[model samples]
Target: EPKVAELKQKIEDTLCPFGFEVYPFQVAWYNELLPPAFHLPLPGPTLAFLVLSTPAMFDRALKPFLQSCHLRMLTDPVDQCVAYHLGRVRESLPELQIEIIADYEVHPNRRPKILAQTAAHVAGAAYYYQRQDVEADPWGNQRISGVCIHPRFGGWFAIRGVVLLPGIEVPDLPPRKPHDCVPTRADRIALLEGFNFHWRDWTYRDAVTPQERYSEEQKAYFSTPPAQRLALLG
Candidate 1:
């Protein structure tokens, strides 16, 4: 049997660099394949985050997960944490717009909030990683994949966190062991959570509104639309 360290190193060396390319996107969408109504509101092209689990993983699904994972570290639930991550990603990638997408047709009445997906696609290769825990067949394939869009570069990218393996097996069979699956350290997770807490606290207290000291003329012209939202603002 390979040592955990060796397996983990292999996993990191082989997979981390790719960072979940398991997520898929339609190359044509970035080129204006969709109608104007579907493309409006987006300032430019965007990147979407695909999920191996469910669309709710980063939106509504996250809150309960975070609460269960570590209660005290959470200033807010997982939804807010996800929003914060989106805001940070926006700040880091100012020119791009990022969102989450669903490739599958769920209930007919499910309209997503502040997020959208293309009408032409469905699920493929999505839940294959979790068949170990659930005995469901047709577990993880996505058609219209979740994506990350970048303005000026539509359908720029997508990411899904899942283990990929070739071929299918019986429900009773265990997940064919991957040589590279590495367990993450709890301490590292805790330290990063603490850092985020401190960072948000300092930014909130030290930052000033852009118009706080504006001159009279500037103030007169400084109106902002109530409906417009900054991706990073609280």
Candidate 2:
């Protein structure tokens, strides 16, 4: 048990500087959902690690990279940053069997539309299911304009990816909290518009800002002390 906590702490500490946060989900709960994707090759993962990017991620760890890309007119800065960070995670803990399931690479056109859903079910985090099954939208909520609304980050954050690890200890059930900060259709639309405009102009101000729009339950989760947050995985 101490070892489990220590491993969890190591992961959170490694990712903290890069503006990433993690949640742990049990394999049993995830197995109940029976996402087809989970049935990968033999020796399947024992835990699902949800790695999310906070709104401040862009401003803190990614903005400078974006700015440099624009100055040189380079492409895929965001993708590059994500890949690099995940790579760092892997390198830091060489023994962990970590596999990253990214959004752009596995949704809508390429693989399956079940990427985020699978992540949420495995991580026991409902936030990952935001706007995916909404009426009239379904997959129309593409471009991540309406995905995964967080209490503090609104739609400003992203489920950059899910990391699957074999033999890691996890909680019996995913932590449950109210959907306090679900954004409206209008909020999603504005976020998308601003993101697109900012992409073209490279103006940092063009992007939407994070908000404190969370319910009491949501606030409670956010208020969890950083030192203890990762222990929730168990």
Candidate 3:
């Protein structure tokens, strides 16, 4: 456990200071909860970690990152920061073969390379509440997407990507189930309904009390259209 623990600690040291979090899980555990299409090709017990950005990231990381260098040409500001930090971690840990997958990465058909919610759920970083979690759900006729709720952050976070130690296997790695913050059927129904219908307003993120939420500046940044986001940054 020392190796994995130390590796995780090292990664946390790099990301945590910037308001990011890392959760570990085995490849098998994630694949067990997903279909073959979303499976990570690594061997069953390979170590993987989900990277997330909390509200603090806006002030703690994004602003600082934006100030540290010139604006990059095309990708998102948050995504650029995540990629840059993840690249540093990969470079820092040259001893281990590290594989990276951004949540936005996709195949020819435009399917996400990694289903961030599923990975977050399996990693026990957050509980991914899906329609099936509800009993006799009312939205059967329409499509409803799942949302990952962090016990502490609620929905005020983003699953940035995943870092995999493909050569490391932890057959005995213990599995931890995510805490079901919204336990009652009534609450879950309210949560999903708010998410599906009022997502633009982000009402669903309030299902559980969050220790911190995005700051006003961050909110303004996100609310701005992507094309105009750069102007806001300036």
Candidate 4:
């Protein structure tokens, strides 16, 4: 039997270099917060985990793939990077069931309805919206965004994948708080529609630029080395 805390740390250590942060959520919390369909292919674990990408990770490690995508326009570097690492997790733990929102194969014309639901309910990924103040809250709360936002990364982080392991006991994270630096829904939509710009670029800019919303501690957290991140998280 593996120690839950140790296992969580091990997974984090292995994937942190790839710009991923793993978060664990209670299965009961998921069931209470989400509908039954969202957990359809759920694992038997009392705890579930999700992997998300951070601005620092993208800027430092995965920037090459993003730049490459701009040059080729044929592939999404973020998705590509995520798929590769998800494969690694599969190889490392064949017993666990892993799920991704979408694949390289023919994707839905628009974002799949269940994608965000599964990511948030099952995988414990936070939701942030392009228009935080304007859009209806999916989670039925005024506090969180419809789009997933990280306190440290703002809207710059991405949910890469989710892991379901039966025996691993992952811990819960603290509640989320809103950031003043996040642009209003109207502002984000105007920028995206008016300039034909990618939201990813917008998220990256808002997350990295120094803002009054960012505390010295949060700023320092992003700069923390991957090896040390898991420890800090604990």
Candidate 5:
């Protein structure tokens, strides 16, 4: 019954053709989970949506973008490709006062501008399995990182950035709990271990069966270090 769906649908239409997914969540939900520095300085607890790239992004967005003109010299090509397509979402809706924060954006002191996993969790886009979710933690003194698992793509997808409608606050927008895909305590433990210890082999991404996974070529491109990734532009 809410107009939020209209905005959501419009945005979905704009992004999904290129294999990107968009999910809308209110600012309050995201702001609830973090401290001051991480909050979006919105006029109110407004509406925000996150965009994530699927396995198809390799053949859909990245390849098509590489063939286009006006390239950046040394910037992360994947980052540039993401920004360009997201930039289109802005232009397509010229009347709205919107802001986009990419996954790579950071403050001068190097704090992430937005916590991708946190936002994803609040948006109900994916279940973020973290060290805290497990009991009788095995790491003890060591650190364990969190990872988000999409019900459909599982760990195969990556959050690109979030879109903010600074001018509009939809407080009535319902909250969405990310699907608890890694439901069992045992699987959660395995997921955390795989993400922290065996991430190089990408076993964590298999916590759930993925409809699509990155191809060997795409995997090879990412396997190359950031500075050397420019060689993959063609």
Candidate 6:
């Protein structure tokens, strides 16, 4: 990919609040949802989960949220803001088949509206499970992601991005946010910071050995050591 001289100059001319830094890499990750085209292990076409919380419970109120947050809809408008990376998969690779499953559409009051999408290994076209149980008797495998050669950050990798929208309950928003609610900025920042700090070490740089790759480092992060992890996220 050649650098566009004019676009480069234009970006330099503008002033953005958050500064940008470029990290170059020899090997980048490419989404391997489409197999046969790839030559390495794919990460996750992991569960791209999106929860829509609202003050109302019935399908009527839920419809707006559904229209607003269309799950797995290819040409939905909301996707305009969220589908940039997915589009990259289409443009750069063009061989991978992105698959999605809406597990719970308009489910009962207490259940979470779940959407599960499979990021198949683009290295070769094969039925990883063929609509079977991923955690079956044969394998309790998890962390199956779409493989990709990352730009600037090279090497084999899996990538996933999510957009969460918190809902307002009744006339006024409620305290003690609902489990499905979009977290507060501070809360979200703290959560992501903890994840990054913990997962950063598991990344390509530190997790060199196979043993280290699946270590218990970040296992109890969600439960143990309350109040220990709290900070801003990029």
Please provide TM-scores, in order, for all candidate models, with all chains considered together.
0.24, 0.56, 0.92, 0.53, 0.91, 0.19
Regions of candidate 1 where Cα sits further than 4 Å from its true position = 1-33, 40-78, 91-115, 119-234
The true-versus-predicted C-alpha distance at residue 101 of model 2, in Å, is: 2.4
* lDDT, candidates in the order shown: 0.28, 0.53, 0.85, 0.52, 0.83, 0.24
Summed backbone clashes in each candidate are 30, 0, 0, 6, 0, 30
lDDT of 2 by residue, 63-147 (tens): 5554454323233555667766777778878876676655334445433333554555345343433344344553453564433
lDDT, candidate 6, 79-193, per-residue tens = 3322432333234433433321221232354332221122211111111122132223222353333212222222222222221111201212111211212123343333233
Q: How well is each residue in 96-187 modelled by candidate 4, as lDDT tens digits?
A: 64444453454664323344433453443543444334565333433332355455655556677655565454444332323444456555
Q: Using TM-score, give the best candidate's number.
A: 3
Clashes in model 3: which pairs?
Answer: none
lDDT of 3 at 185: 93
lDDT of 4: 0.52
Model 1 TM-score is 0.24
- Which candidate number has the best lDDT? 3
Instruction: Rank the candidate models, highest TM-score first.
Output: 3, 5, 2, 4, 1, 6
Error of 4 at 232 (Å): 38
Model 5 residue 108 lDDT score: 64
Worst 10 residues of 3 by lDDT: 103-112
For model 1, how does the per-residue alpha-carbon lDDT over 110-228 read when each residue is reduced to its tens digit?
33322232311212221112122223433255322222222211222123322211121122321222111112234222222332344312122112111223233222222333232
Which candidate do you rate higher for lDDT, 1 or 3?
3
Q: What stretches of model 4 exceed 4 Å from their correct place?
A: 43-45, 59-75, 94-145, 167-234
What stretches of model 6 exceed 4 Å from their correct place? 1-4, 15-18, 21-143, 147-200, 205-234
